[PDB]
């Protein structure tokens, strides 16, 4: 499904995302918006051999398990496919776990490349919260 700017916004407010961790709803929206562009279908194969999935591409190194990553962790515990379905609140509890883990939103690199430090706040501005 590929998500509406207000629509997500919305989904991840009503799943706790707003300010987790000190994070504003407009730091997701962003980082969704450049990861996947709003779409819960988008992979991604990385050189190391490992996947990224879904709306907010995590990977399958370390969170999830696609049975094709020699070594990977499956933090998240759940297969790689959950995160690529209509409903958010897989890809949304995992979000929750890496951005706990430390580095923050760093972790997401279309984060930190194009949104940290940026007006975040105009993601959400129109939207109906």
Sequence with gaps: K?????????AMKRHGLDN?????????????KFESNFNTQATNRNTDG?????????????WC????????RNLCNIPCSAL??????????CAKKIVSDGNGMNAWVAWR?????????????????
Aim: with cysteine; hydrophobic share 35%; net charge positive.
């Design 50 to 62: 490992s996947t990224d999935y879904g709306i907010l591409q995590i990977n399958s190194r370390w």
């Design 84 to 93: 690529l379905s209509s409903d958010i609140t897989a890809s949304v509890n």
């Design 20 to 32: 987790y961790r000190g994070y504003s709803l407009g730091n997701w929206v962003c980082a969704a």
């Design 113 to 129: 490349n194009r949104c940290k430090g940026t007006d975040v706040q105009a993601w959400i501005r129109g939207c109906r919260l």
């Design 2 to 10: 590929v998500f509406g700017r207000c629509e997500l916004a919305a």
């Design 65 to 72: 398990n696609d049975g094709r990553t020699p070594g990977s």
